[model samples]
Target: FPTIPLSRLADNAWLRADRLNQLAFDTYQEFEEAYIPKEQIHSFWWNPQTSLCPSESIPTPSNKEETQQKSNLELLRISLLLIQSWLEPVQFLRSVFANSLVYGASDSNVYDLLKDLEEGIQTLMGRLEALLKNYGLLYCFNKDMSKVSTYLRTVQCRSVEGSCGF
Candidate 1:
């Protein structure tokens, strides 16, 4: 994934929109590549044991734990996808704002709008991080290419109405 400078989020509207779109695409790709396989493998190996005999088979504790683990990961992946969906509109609006500015429109309100959007993004990221940590899947939420953390800090210093309320 490409690294986009956070400053460009305010300085260059087109670049910011492009970067945001890339972020969403990258996140979906990541979820598909990393999480989908785990879910499929778990489904294949963890199917319920069955037999004709009365004393056929029973689920073991380990099997139950593995099932739980797979479910948690699956849930996490779904939530991540939801986050990506939620971000798509924000990215679109940012693009629209940038285009407006290109046509001689003032950006006097852009700061507040971006700031509010950033806060909501921050809130979602925090919830995502907490969810991953709770499931012991924090490794999946890589700190290094974190679009959330990147955008978060850039808009952190600004304040707007209803900021941080999300």
Candidate 2:
């Protein structure tokens, strides 16, 4: 196989990946601006009290918007990274399983590597979900973002803990 550079993936296979990442992050920023302006919720969760309160009812976000942006960026980053790993010249089974990151170095290092990848992906999906839920509420057309987030979570975490018994 070939080890594709991030530049190639961004320019070719993952073009939409960059767009999606940007859209998600941008929208998150807009939401933060509208809801928690001064307090900046990105530094922490979108807490109504601690975040920027435009009014007693609606809180303007401080940094939560950036947090959402970061989450979306992470999803895109990981997806791109995984795709690049797959395109590398390593042996098929060895490359795929080894990059998974589930298991550690061993005789058949592939299995452990896969395990680690699976766990890492699961963790990222969880974070993405939380970000979507927070930022989605701010917009009427949030369905698309929510849907994409859900899709990513499902696809990335398809291999559960015991599914492969690494």
Which residue pairs show backbone clashes in model 1? none
lDDT of each: 0.33, 0.36
lDDT digits (tens) for residues 1-166 of candidate 2: 4354323322332223333334434554554565554645644454433222112232112343432444444544544343333223223234322333223312344333334434444444444353333543323122233333333442333322212110
lDDT by residue (tens digit), candidate 1, 10-86: 23422333344444344434444444556654553365222211112322123324423433223333323423433
Residue ranges of candidate 2 with Cα displaced over 4 Å: 1-10, 40-133, 136-166
Model 1, runs deviating above 4 Å = 1-11, 38-166
**TM per prediction:** 0.21, 0.25
Which prediction has the highest TM-score against the true structure? 2
